[PDB]
Every structure is written in structure tokens, then in C-alpha cells.
Design an enzyme around this catalytic site. Structure first.
Site, PDB file in Angstrom:
ATOM      1  CE  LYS F 147      -3.974  -0.206   2.030  1.00 55.80           C
ATOM      2  NZ  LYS F 147      -4.991  -0.161   3.116  1.00 55.80           N
TER       3      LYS F 147
HETATM    4  C1  LIG Z   1      -5.961  -1.560  -4.108  1.00 55.96           C
HETATM    5  C2  LIG Z   1      -6.594  -2.204  -2.869  1.00 55.96           C
HETATM    6  N1  LIG Z   1      -7.009  -3.526  -3.175  1.00 55.96           N
HETATM    7  C3  LIG Z   1      -7.624  -4.368  -2.234  1.00 55.96           C
HETATM    8  C4  LIG Z   1      -7.824  -3.836  -0.930  1.00 55.96           C
HETATM    9  C5  LIG Z   1      -8.488  -4.829   0.008  1.00 55.96           C
HETATM   10  O1  LIG Z   1      -7.644  -5.278   0.985  1.00 55.96           O
HETATM   11  P1  LIG Z   1      -8.057  -5.590   2.498  1.00 55.96           P
HETATM   12  O2  LIG Z   1      -8.482  -4.229   3.038  1.00 55.96           O
HETATM   13  O3  LIG Z   1      -6.762  -6.059   3.117  1.00 55.96           O
HETATM   14  O4  LIG Z   1      -9.008  -6.671   2.571  1.00 55.96           O
HETATM   15  C6  LIG Z   1      -7.443  -2.487  -0.486  1.00 55.96           C
HETATM   16  C7  LIG Z   1      -7.637  -1.886   0.896  1.00 55.96           C
HETATM   17  N2  LIG Z   1      -8.503  -0.665   0.682  1.00 55.96           N
HETATM   18  C8  LIG Z   1      -8.282   0.322   1.810  1.00 55.96           C
HETATM   19  C9  LIG Z   1      -8.541   1.803   1.388  1.00 55.96           C
HETATM   20  C10 LIG Z   1     -10.001   2.207   1.076  1.00 55.96           C
HETATM   21  C11 LIG Z   1     -10.386   3.558   1.721  1.00 55.96           C
HETATM   22  O5  LIG Z   1      -9.887   4.551   1.144  1.00 55.96           O
HETATM   23  O6  LIG Z   1     -11.120   3.511   2.700  1.00 55.96           O
HETATM   24  C12 LIG Z   1      -9.182  -0.099   2.983  1.00 55.96           C
HETATM   25  O7  LIG Z   1     -10.335  -0.751   2.849  1.00 55.96           O
HETATM   26  O8  LIG Z   1      -8.607   0.277   4.165  1.00 55.96           O
HETATM   27  C13 LIG Z   1      -6.832  -1.712  -1.488  1.00 55.96           C
HETATM   28  O9  LIG Z   1      -6.401  -0.445  -1.296  1.00 55.96           O
END
Ligand SMILES: Cc1[nH+]cc(COP(=O)(O)O)c(CN[C@@H](CCC(=O)O)C(=O)O)c1O
Ligand SMILES: Cc1[nH+]cc(COP(=O)(O)O)c(CN[C@@H](CCC(=O)O)C(=O)O)c1O
Ligand SMILES: Cc1[nH+]cc(COP(=O)(O)O)c(CN[C@@H](CCC(=O)O)C(=O)O)c1O
Ligand SMILES: Cc1[nH+]cc(COP(=O)(O)O)c(CN[C@@H](CCC(=O)O)C(=O)O)c1O
Ligand SMILES: Cc1[nH+]cc(COP(=O)(O)O)c(CN[C@@H](CCC(=O)O)C(=O)O)c1O
Ligand SMILES: Cc1[nH+]cc(COP(=O)(O)O)c(CN[C@@H](CCC(=O)O)C(=O)O)c1O
Lengths: 297, 298, 301, 305, 298, 294
Positions: F147
């Protein structure tokens, strides 16, 4: 110079100094040759060649890709390979079978040059972990160069990457495919470990390593869970362990990639254990793997 | 067998039978060699080698790519090239200089094998119908996979695969596309096409910068044709008035058909034929304005 | 419904209701057809077809790509094209020549179906003759690589890609779609070629995987005739976002100024002076008001 | 000419001569149509259509991709497909349902043309009682045309326009002397044949290719189940042309191709150089299944009588 | 620490210590910022900013790509840029204007955060032997992945990764290839090569349209050099007579080696050295023909 | 403004208004930062942070990609994350840890700027998608497994496009044309009772994706990991996204084409329910995933 000694040249052994070919040979100009890398290890019952039949099968398979005709039956070549060990009194050695297009003509098309000339030569044959650097040279796409075969010309790509890595201060190069995914080392296959699970990389554009194949079987036999996947460079950066496999590299732990420490920053337990069991297997200490050995005596 | 005769081997000529190298030579196993293709034509003033300077310069440039060290000064190689023609009594011939990594070691890294070994050999060397091409299922290597600007031995595995395929398909030569789908080059030559009186040379992209291509562009401009350098697709060729290939061996060869689709009228066109005529006049020493391209052996 | 009227069917005109083909036609199942788009404009000297010969040449060139045999000489088709305008009494109209593989067999290979069947239809278009500018949106569908579909030809199947992009654009609230090639560079509109202007210079896009537009060609000649510098280049979406002007060209689109792409205003946010000028001169040319461009016109009467 | 006979045209059967559409139909100009390929085989209980509902499901799924509206319930089409076999007195036949955008307008956008017009035609298919051609195996040649990327043409759908790609590859292969074309994707990996899916066998293991940019073959699906039922290990992988060159066996699957052994690719013999035991066995059991001789596979058949 | 001094913050100058922003700023989390690199050189008539107008134009152009709103008129920013130089007493300095999305919210969509906050900071501101480059294992972003024509903060993660790699390998700078394998640009500069006296500038492809590149081409042409714009591969550079980079910070920097392969003679070449010198004469106000490019602060 | 309250700044909590950094910070100019997204849910036993260990591990893994040095031990960050919830009296919130390269220098190379500065803030806490015209970055362009701040320019551009097009979220394809992920979520689809999770390819290895797969398998669903095309989703019975913020979100439409029934499907709804039960501490078998703050 290389200390090969007696070399099998198209059916008969000759002194090294006599094992020569015309400089007009098609392969010397256009990379039209195929080869193998096979090892023999010393055991309690004399020298044992590791997975001879699989390597010979691949030798002929590599030739088929170039529509190259090998004027000898596999059984003959296998005999020649065993003899190059005996005749030279080798115990632990590396065996290099080679089939190349001769000097009948130099038009780029190699068909008129068949059958290929053949020879077999051989010569006497980690804790911190190997250091790798991702290459700026991409592994050839599957419709550009035949990656499942050990064709001479393919190794120009390997050579460019290896030189680059060494010049950068690393031990080996890690090549990505044109799409950006991890492919293989200049002469090895790659694996990584994450949360107890061993991940072997898919074949993609790589060579289907016999060591890779052996490693997978051993890992499963030891009780490890093995998954085959497509991997990115940063999945390796974040892995608990990373290691390479190959006939020459056996099982080599990788402690760093692109100056980024892998896990603890030194060889990990899984890679060290796999390497050890692999060594026990090739030296005839594991009855379960006796089928992989060909004792020359 | 090839009738080369006396071959130059690292500073000295030897009978063809003595021109051999160890089967443990790095280049025999890993495609680590570089070579050139040079032609000598007969003229009223004796045999003349075409653009010897440019070819030797490219020979050394190819070595640079592999970080290969050629233990001879360009001048020495140039003298060797002239002498391979003389000593063998050649007039019309193809000259093949070759530099390859020897047998000091067989680790994939070629640096420990420097300097490279060198040799120069040579041998004595329809059109209206036009050549027929078939687009290959093998793509020309991307610029970060194999060094397409150099004549590295290994590169020709790609060319060999395409050529075998084209011949097996009943065509004269293969036309390779790059991985993105655009036309690249023939297995051993560069491509051009003509549309509405304008000559279109293909960009260098992943191809070799042909010396014949270079010669053809200069000739075309001298003759007054407008020349544009562009990227081309297979269907742009299918729809062209003319298509032709250029190369040391192919000279200027008209292409009358591609993938069983006739080009223009279906036979050699006027533009390609004029360029071929002037080119042949040039290499045979009949064009004073191009004498600078020739090196007379006598 | 389309008010075509008399349609030329393989050598002779018939009423529209009779211009039909078997539902077993190869082209209806496998996209194996080629077509053209030609405009006729009303001039002081009657209807004038714009660059008829260039379009007919492309029609046959497209067929060549599919190894399709058109059983008529170019001269015959040009006469049929002139006649479709006359017999229907059209002034300004759109002409749609079409060649398709018939119903001899339905194997994927089209060769056994040769020769192709041919027809020429036309309908009133542009009965009346922009400053706000068209709004484009970059498509999620990439223009086909040159070794996937023959982008230099107007092959029926090619337009599935165009159709998908256009539907997407309209659904997103835009006037047209801007497609990128698989590498990420700008290619063309679903049915138009693209240009942009920056610091007084006119930039036409390279042919890449696009159709070699006849309108594009005309606009370039006009631009140069007017004294503008014209460069042919490869372009990215952000080069367009930053241009002073952007415009599309096409037989149907003529010269259309583009004032917005992906909700980002182009230059002043409305049609620019260059595109508007090129459009005016182009319209004067096609309507027979420019003696220097008469060679491009074929007066039916 | 095609001997189709009575054709179902938008709700009712009509003589072939009357099954026509305007030359101004959108699909004739822009490839905006979808179609299916279904086989009916003779059985001891009369003609049986193979996996009808699966094919009809794909038909409607293909339409969804083009945002094409089919003004008929799947139940109606299935009945028309049965009736096209009955009414024409067919036994072993090929059925071609087709839905295409009509002539309401010729703007490239097809939405204004909805709903689509539909027809179901069928014609006799000669049963093969020989063996030489099959045992000799088909010869393939890798095409110079790449299979369309998933963001260029919808490869999971049987959209008319898609077949321009298939047609170009087929003509090329045939012109080169081969029986069929093998297309690679833009990246260089094996995709599928011009109208078939691919499999290969190595050391007793059957390898089906991943779906990638290919059509999800119903024959491919059937073959995988049959293989597993027979005890073979089946893996799904991505493959290169040279993995095929050195395989023990290679074979194609498709509604028209059934299970076809491939004995040579790019003039390079596959394994022994003739059809292998694995492909021949799968073909055998597959044919027993579609002809109603395998009780365990009866659920795949729809008897018209 | 950076000796910036007085920094222009959204309308007024403040001591460096007070030039801060919330750690919840959208740009600190998602790379949603745009910036410029502008230089002022000392002349006989005091400090002179080089092509200020073009740089300001590009600044707003970059913001447009992110649909970012700059709450200031270009004329206002231009004055602020002139003031950051004089109020700090700078002669030769680098000016860094920056616009970034603030802390109104942290949803990935930046539109809710408009208008952007803006600041302008400045600080007091290889060529001898030629720079050494290494081709990166990080490919320059495709034009449909990151907006390469804009100086968007996030874009520089790609540049940072490449630069670190090159430095770790022992080189001065990184040369990035595009995903197709062709040469793109340096981590922070544009590339040119020279062959047989002809200067070759690389096409814009996925690179930034450099203002220094633009300046270099005009200068080269004014000096009588033939300039061509092309697509290039790594081996075309290996085989070139000279290679050089251009950039606001890099000015005109000769490249003597790439991937341990010497370029030409292996040292800074005459064409690159000449272009560099003329460029310096232009920016320091010694060439009347280029006076229009300068904005004297006094 | 964001109601964050007390923010942990390099080892100590400070009022929000004091949580600031120099505008000359490397990360503000070059996207050189890494962050995490963590959630805390209310439970019968007080606030519980979901899979804290995994999120922190990924945080340090992200820094490694940039060769960024985090001057704190993971155990220290964990305590800070727990403290940010406690000290602010939060129950249901979103936690945002962030590490960024500071203002020591502004050369593009971030190494000279180490060690990174770190802060942890928190605040009180079917879909229609459209395929984006922006492709997800190849694995040799941007490190998609991490990230990294700069990575989100690609996500931001796609999200704005989707919203501007009238959609709720953007679906990005990779450069080759295959489905990648949402601007901030991972994707799954369902066909004939089988659940298909998309391969990691160039995407983030979602922790929510990981949880959903385990949940699915426990419920008896067959799960396959595959590469997918846009039309495989169009033709699927169901489609859903997973993410820390999105939890399990059913997708009823993509590119104006209804998915299956056109509304949330049965499988997505069941997975969503079990996941919600798990994060709120109502599933004993999943308690290992929770870290109770009290
Ligand atoms: C590109 C991306 N892809 C997949 C995921 C899913 O991953 P996980 O959260 O580990 O299951 C996240 C987290 N997205 C973060 C940012 C969204 C927001 O701005 O709010 C989040 O859900 O913290 C991503 O940023
Ligand atoms: C490209 C390549 N990839 C993978 C492998 C590993 O395959 P295997 O050996 O079957 O497990 C090898 C052999 N690498 C040779 C290196 C040559 C050398 O002498 O060094 C080897 O081990 O013979 C390769 O050359
Ligand atoms: C890939 C390639 N491309 C283009 C050319 C044309 O370049 P030039 O020769 O400089 O104009 C050649 C030389 N092709 C050699 C093949 C001859 C052979 O017998 O092999 C040649 O003409 O020497 C190539 O090998
Ligand atoms: C893909 C495409 N690209 C560019 C052009 C522009 O080319 P030209 O017309 O020669 O300048 C056209 C013609 N677009 C036809 C169909 C649009 C319509 O539905 O009408 C047209 O304008 O006839 C295309 O179909
Ligand atoms: C591109 C394509 N790929 C794979 C298949 C195999 O799918 P399946 O039939 O569901 O197992 C088919 C059907 N090929 C049809 C047309 C070819 C022909 O005319 O023959 C077919 O077999 O009906 C394809 O058209
Ligand atoms: C990717 C990139 N490419 C090309 C250039 C050259 O463009 P121009 O400056 O307009 O000629 C620059 C500016 N590189 C900045 C980085 C310097 C720094 O690291 O500080 C610069 O020169 O300001 C780039 O960042």
C-alpha cells in the site's frame, strides 16, 4: 581451459584436443544447438547419475522444438553418458550432452543441415544465502524463443542477465517476463515460502526444471503444503524465504533480492532442510528416491 | 559442404579443414557469437566489396552488446576481409566474419571467456515474378529480450524458426511481427512498401538497421521519390501498391504476395525494380556518385 | 426504419422490401463483410459525391484482407453508387456499399463462400447544415492489435469493438468514445480519427491500429493548404488533456471539435478556432464552393 | 447451398426460401449477432440433443455481453430447437440458433435496434463410421493471428464479429496445408483453435488449458468430467506451444470436433505421431455418452421423441 | 535539513518552520499532488528564471490531469515564484512549486478535497567524465496506468524505485524502458543519442515532455545540427557515438557509459559538451537569441 | 474536516491540529509513503480490532518495498493502534497507520531521508461497477502488493471516473485485459454454486479476501482461484467485492449489465453475514482474528 578429458564424439570417444568442429557450423553462427546439464554424485555404491532418463528425454524434446534430428537412439546416448563418467574416472561431475547443426550450409534455415552432430563431455564438479537482483532483460515470451527447451540461442538472454547481475554485485539474476511477473533465474527455477506454505512458480515461459520437480516431490513427502502460482517481485520481497533450484544450484537459499532482505536476511530453515534432503537423495541415502539414481558401476 | 577455401583464423589463413574450434566453445552452447554478412561484386576494375567500413563497424558494435572483446583492430579485420577474397581468387562472393566466445569456461556468463576468437570465411555467391511471404507465428524479439540491433548468433534461433515455418508453408520467406502485432522484418531482411508513389521504409523498431535498407533510402531520394519512415501493420502491406525486401543477400527483392494475398498487380512493381536496378549498378561500380561505397580488392 | 428506397442488389436495383438475404449468410454469423461510408452533398451543381474513387479503392482493399472476391469491377460499383443517388432523387445523403459472404456454407472458413454478394444503399442525411464541442470519454475497450483484427479495413466484425465502446460512451453520458490501443496510447474514436492542436501546430495521430481515414487525409491537405504546420505523432490521453484543441474527423463526423475528454475541459472548454476553421473550409470543399478541391467531387448530374 | 429445410423465424417455422432478413440489418454490417452450435445424435430412443440447456444458457449469456435483448423466454427457444429437429425429421444434425440486430438503424450503437431478431436452423450431419482419419490425427499449425485480448472482443461469448479472427486463422491454416489453426494469445501462450478448445497429455496426466481469452467449451467441460470419471488426473494450466510439442498427446474438443486427436503441430509430430490411447478413449466414451449409451450421462441428453 | 527559508503558503510567505500541512492530507496518503522544477541562474543583470511561463503552464496542466483545482491565477503563482527568489536573496537556485490535495477527507477520490493547497519553496542550487547509467528493472508506466505527461507526485514512486536501484548498483542514474522494451527516459530526465553527427531526440512516448529537451533541440538546430526524433532501443544507445540526458536539474549531462558498456570513446563527447555549454550561455543571458526564455527577477 | 482527535505522532499522542509535517516532506512530493486500513467493531466484550497482526505485518512489508525504515518495533505500533482507539473513546472506527519519507532532502532517491516518520490516526466509522479506462499497474511498474501512497493515483483516477460515470466503484483491468481489482477492493464471482476468487496477479493480497475464502470453505462452498475476464463476470450468477472498508459488498451490475438476478445474490449475502458475525465477536471459531481493546 576446461578439464574434460575423453569426449564422446558422434559414437566414439576421442581426446579433448580432438573434439573440435568446423567454424562454419550452423550452430556457431545461429545458436542452433540444444544441450543438457546432468550431474553424478558419489555414493556408497560408486557414482550415481541423477535422473538420467528425464534429462535425456528433455534433450530429445529440445531437439524436436528445432526440428533437429539426433542420429542416435536415447539408449545409445544414455550409454555414452555413463561411459563419459567411467572412462574419465569421475565420481562427482557435471555432464554436458550437446547436439548442434553442422557445417553443411549456412542459410538461416537449419533443416538442410540435419542430422545434428552430437557429443557428450563431462568434468569434475548458501548459509548466508545467495543475493539476487532483478534483471533489466525480460525472459523471452513463449512465441519468441522456445523456453521449454534448452536451445543454445536462448542462453544469450541468460548470459546478458547473468553478466548484469554480477556487474551489479549480486550472485545471480532474477528475470521477469515481458508482463512484469517473476519468471526464473538465468539458469534456475524459483520458489518462495510464506506462512509455512511452499510456493513453486508456474512454468509460464520458464524451463520445466527437473530439480524443481524433484524439490516439489520431496517437499510434499516431508509434509509441506505446496502451491503452484504466478508471482510478482514484491511477493518475493515479502516472503519468509526464497530459494532457487537447478542441476548446478541444487537447492540454493536466497537471502536478498534487490538489496532487500528476505525474511531474516539469511538462509531459512525450509530451504536449508530441502537442500539437505535433496543432497541425501542424490547421494543414495533415501530408499524412497532410489528410482532417480543410475549407478555407473 | 561449403566451398570456402582458405579461412582467416585469428590473424592467419588456414585450409578450411584446419578451421575448427573446440566443441566446448561457449558460443556453441549459448549462442554467444556475432557475425557479419558482406558482399563483393565484380566490376570493370576488379572485385569490389560493398560498404566494408559500415559492416566492420557494425561487427564491432554487435560485440559491444555482448561485452565481447575482439582482439584485433578494425583495420586488421578489413585487410583480412580483402585478403580472403584475393587469396581464394573470388570475384562475386559472400564474406562471413565471425567472432565467438571460446572454450575457457562454460558458465553462462561469457566475460571469463574474453577475448573472443575470430575468423573470416568467404564463398562464391523470377525476380519479376516476385517473392512470396507468409507472416510468421513467431514474433520478433522485444528490444529487452534479445539485442535486435546486433547480429548475435542466438538471435537467429528466432529467425531460423520463422524461416523453417515459411518454407514449410510453401513461401519463399517469413515476415515477422513484433509482439505488439506490427510488422517487424523478414527472417533475414528489412521491409519497405510503396503507396501512391510514396516509398515507406519501416522504422527500426526491434529490427536490424540494414545497410542495404540504408542504401535503398539514399538511392530512392536521389531518384526523387519521397520517403517516409513509419510503423506498419500487415494489412497496410496487403493494401500497398508494392512491397519489397532489402538485405545483403536479398539485395532489393520485390514481394508480389503476402499470406496468399497478391500485392498490387501481383508481380514485381516499377519502383522496387528501379531501386534494384540502380542498386545493382552501384555495387558493380557503374555509378560514380556511389563509388564511395566500394572497396576495390585490386 | 431506414428510408433507403431503391437498393442496388448484385447488378440491379430493387425496392427496399426486396433487398434481403438468407439468415444463413456467412456474414450474419461470423462478421465476414466489408463496407464503406460515402457522403454526397448538395452543391450549386447538384449532388456531389465526396472522394468516391478513394472510398471504392478502400472497399476493394478491405475485401482483399478477407480474401473476399467482389464479382464486379470498380467502375461498375462507382456507376451503381452514382445511380443510387440519382434513382432515389437524393441530394445530401449517406451511401453504404456492402459486400458480404453468402449462404453457400457455414464453416468458419469463408473461402468456399466466394464470390461475395454485393449491394449499395443510400438514405437522406445531413438535410441541414458544434461550437459547444463534443464530449468524449476514454473507453474501457481497447482498439484491436494489428494481428487480432484488420484495423485498416472496414470489416463487419471489427465494429463489435466499436459498438461496445460507443454504447459505453453514451451510457456514461458522453457523445463518443475515445479508444486506446492495448499499449495504452490513443488510437481513434469508435468511428472517427483524432487530431489535437498545441501552440499553433496541428498534430494528426499516426495510423497505428486505426483506419486510414479519408476525412483525416482531406483535413491534413486542407490544413497545409491554409499554412498550418502538421505533424504526425503517437499520443497519450494526457497529451490531449493538455492540448489547446482536439477534434475528430470522419465521413459522418466531418470535422467535429472536441471540448471535453473524461470530464476534463480541452483548452477554453468550447470549440477552438483551428478546428472551426478547418471545418468551415472542409464544408466549403464538399459543397463544391472551393475550386481548388473540385477534383475530390463527383457530380452525379 | 445449405439443406436446412424448415427454419424457426421469430416464433414460427417457415420454408428456407423465406428465412431472410434485410441487407440493412445491423449485424450484417457490424457483426452484432450471437449464435450457438448444438448437436443432436441418434440413439435407441430417437434423436437426442446434447446439453441443450447449457447451450441455451450460453446463448442468452452471449446476448448479455452485447446488451442484446432476446424477446423470447429460454423455454420457447428450447422448444423451437426441439421442433426444428422433429419438423425436419432429422436424426444426426447440427443446430444453429442465431440472434441478430435488425435493420431499425445503422448507427454503430446497437441499442436502438433492440430487441434482436431470432432464428433457429438445422441441417443433417453425417455420422462417421470410419477410423483412419481419426487414428491418423489432425494436423495443426500455429496461426499468425493472435486470439483477441479480453478487453478487445468478448471471447467468452459467441459473438458474430469474433469469428472474423477465427476465419482469418482458419484460412491461413488450410492454405498452409493443415487441418486447423492453433491460435496464441497476444502474450504468446496457447489460446484455442479457430473453433475448438485444447488439451494435452503428459505422463498419464491430462492437462486442460485455462479459459484465458477462450470460449468456455461445453465439450471441454464434458471431456473433463468424463476423464475424471475414468480415473485420470486432470489439471488446468496455461500452456506454451513447446509444451504441446513435447506432450505425449494433444487433442481438441468442440461441438463439431467432438474429441479430435492432434498428431502434429507445426510439422512437429506429437508423441508417437498418430492419435494416442488417451484421446481415443475419451472420444470413445464421449461418443457413447452423446448416443445415449452411458446411463451416468443421460442427464446431458434431451430426447426429441 | 533543506535551507528553504521563506516559503509561499497559499497566498503569503511564512518562515520554513511554519510551512506545514496536516498528516491527514490526501496527498500524503495517495500521491495526489503536482509539482514543478524551475531554475534561476545568475546573470550580469541579476537572477533570471528559465522559461517560467512554460513551467507554470505545465504546472496547471498537471493539475488538470488529476482534476485538481488550483485556487490561484497563473499570474499570481508567477509573482510568488519571483518573490521566493528575491525575498530569500537567492541568485542561483532551484524553485519547487507544489499543489496538493488536503485533509478534508480520506476517500481515495480526491474531488471532495478541492481546491488544492499550494506552496512555492526554493533553495540555493559527472559532467566532467560523463554520467554512468544502468537500465532499470522497473519499467516506465504505460500511458493508461499513470499520467506520464504530468508531474504527479505518485508517478515518482516509479522514478524513486529506479533511482535507488541504479545508485545501489553503482551508477549515477537510471535509464527506464517502457513496458514494450524500448528506452523511455531517466528517473528524472529525457534522453538523446548522437550517431554519425546526427542528433536523435527520443519521442515523447510515455515520458514527460521536457522543457530542457525542447530547449536543447532548438539550440542544436540553431547550431546547424540535424535533429531527428525517434523511438530507440537500449542497443541503439550502446552503439551510439554519444548519449546525453536533459532536465531542469541535470541541465545537459553527457553519458559516458550504460550497463557497463562504454558509449563511443567512453567519455563525455563533443556534441553533448557543446550543447551543454551553449545551454549555459543561454540561461545566463549571454545569447541574445534566447533572451525570450529568461525572466529577470530584478 | 476529519474528526480524528488525538493522533499518535512518532511515539506520542498529540491533538489533531498539532499532527502536521513539513510541506517539503519527500512523500508529499513523490508519493513515498505506506499506510494501512484497519477496522475496529463493537462487540459484547468491547471494541475489537480485526486481524491487527496481519495488517501490521503488511505495513512493515510495504515499507520494505520502498526500502523504508520504520523506527519502531511492530509491537510498539500495535500498542499505538490499540491506544488510538482507547484514548479517543472509539468503538466502531477506521484506523489509518501511515509512514512517510520526511523533509531531509528532496532528491527523488528516498534513502537519504530514512528513517521514516510514522503516525496512527483513527475516526468513528448491491453496488454498481463500471470498468475503468485506467489499467491496474503491471508488477514491474508499481508494487501492487504494497500500500504505497503513489500507487493510489491509479486508484484515484479510476474511482473519479466511475463516480463521474454514475457508478459506485471502479473495476480495473490489468494491461493484458484481464480483471484485476477494484480501486480499493478485491473481486470474486460465483457460477453454478462454485466461488471464484481472483488470483493475486497485480492486486493487493486482501486480508478481507483471505477471510472470505476461509469463511466460504467453512460453509462448504467450493472455492477456486482463477484469472478472469470482464465477460466471465457479466455471465456470472454473482459478483462481490471484499475490503476492510467495503467488508463484503455484493455487486448487482457492471457496465450497465445486471449480474444474475440483478440484485444481491444468496452466496454473497451469506458470506457477508458470517463475516459481520465474525468481526463483531459472535463466531467462536474466528475469535483468533480479534484483538480486544479492553
Ligand atoms: C488496491 C486495494 N485492493 C484491495 C484492498 C483490500 O484489501 P483488504 O483491506 O486487506 O481486505 C485495499 C484496501 N482498501 C483500503 C482503502 C479504502 C479507503 O480509502 O477507505 C481499505 O479498505 O482500508 C486496497 O487499497
Ligand atoms: C533457463 C534455465 N532454467 C532452469 C534450469 C533448471 O533446470 P534443472 O537443471 O532441470 O533443474 C536450467 C538449467 N541450469 C543449468 C546451468 C548451466 C551451468 O553450467 O551453470 C544447469 O543446472 O545445468 C536453466 O538453464
Ligand atoms: C535480422 C536481419 N535483418 C536485416 C538484415 C539486412 O541487413 P543488411 O544485410 O545490412 O542490409 C539481415 C542480414 N541478413 C543476412 C542473411 C544472409 C544469409 O545467408 O544468412 C545477410 O544479408 O548477410 C538480418 O540478419
Ligand atoms: C473505426 C473507424 N475509424 C475512422 C473512420 C473515419 O474514416 P473516414 O470516414 O474515411 O474519414 C471510420 C468511418 N466511420 C463510418 C461509420 C460511422 C457511421 O455509423 O456513420 C463513416 O463515417 O461512414 C471508422 O469506422
Ligand atoms: C472459438 C470457439 N472455441 C471453442 C469452441 C468449443 O466449444 P463447444 O462447442 O461449446 O464445446 C467453439 C464452438 N465451435 C462451433 C463452430 C465451429 C464449426 O462450425 O465447427 C461448434 O463446434 O459448433 C468455438 O467457436
Ligand atoms: C520524469 C521526468 N522526466 C523528464 C524531466 C525533465 O524535464 P525538464 O525539467 O522539463 O526539462 C523531469 C524533471 N526532473 C526534475 C527532478 C530534479 C530533482 O530530483 O530535484 C527536475 O529536473 O526538476 C522529470 O521528473
Amino acid at each position: 581451459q576446461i578439464k574434460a578429458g575423453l569426449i564422446w564424439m558422434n559414437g566414439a570417444f576421442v581426446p579433448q584436443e580432438e573434439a573440435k568442429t568446423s567454424v562454419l557450423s550452423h550452430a556457431l553462427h545461429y545458436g542452433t544447438s540444444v544441450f543438457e546439464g546432468i550431474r553424478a554424485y558419489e555414493t556408497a555404491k560408486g557414482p550415481a547419475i541423477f535422473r538420467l532418463k528425464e534429462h535425456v528425454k528433455r534433450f530429445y524434446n529440445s531437439a524436436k522444438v528445432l526440428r533437429m534430428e539426433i542420429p542416435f537412439a536415447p539408449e545409445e546416448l544414455e550409454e555414452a553418458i555413463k561411459e563419459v563418467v567411467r572412462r574419465n574416472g569421475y565420481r562427482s561431475c557435471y555432464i554436458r550432452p550437446l547436439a548442434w547443426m553442422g557445417a553443411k550450409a549456412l542459410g538461416v534455415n537449419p533443416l538442410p543441415n540435419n542430422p545434428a552432430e552430437v557429443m557428450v563431455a563431462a568434468w569434475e564438479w548458501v548459509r548466508k544465502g545467495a543475493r539476487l537482483i532483478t534483471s533489466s532483460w525480460a525472459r523471452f515470451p513463449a512465441n519468441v524463443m522456445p523456453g521449454k527447451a534448452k536451445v543454445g540461442g536462448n542462453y544469450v538472454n541468460s548470459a546478458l542477465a547473468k553478466m548484469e547481475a554480477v556487474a551489479a554485485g549480486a550472485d545471480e539474476a532474477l528475470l521477469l517476463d515481458e508482463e512484469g511477473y517473476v519468471a526464473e533465474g538465468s539458469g534456475e527455477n524459483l520458489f518462495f515460502v510464506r506462512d509455512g506454505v511452499i510456493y513453486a512458480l508456474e512454468h509460464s515461459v520458464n524451463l520445466e526444471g527437473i530439480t524443481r520437480d524433484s524439490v516439489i516431490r520431496i517437499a510434499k513427502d516431508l509434509g509441506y503444503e505446496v502451491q503452484v502460482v504466478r508471482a510478482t517481485r514484491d511477493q518475493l520481497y515479502m516472503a519468509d524465504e526464497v530459494f532457487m533450484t537447478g542441476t548446478a544450484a541444487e537447492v540454493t537459499p536466497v537471502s536478498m533480492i534487490d538489496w532487500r532482505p528476505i525474511g531474516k536476511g539469511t538462509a531459512g530453515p525450509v530451504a536449508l532442510r530441502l537442500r539437505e534432503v535433496y543432497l541425501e537423495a542424490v547421494t543414495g541415502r533415501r530408499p524412497e528416491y532410489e528410482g532417480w539414481l543410475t549407478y555407473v558401476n
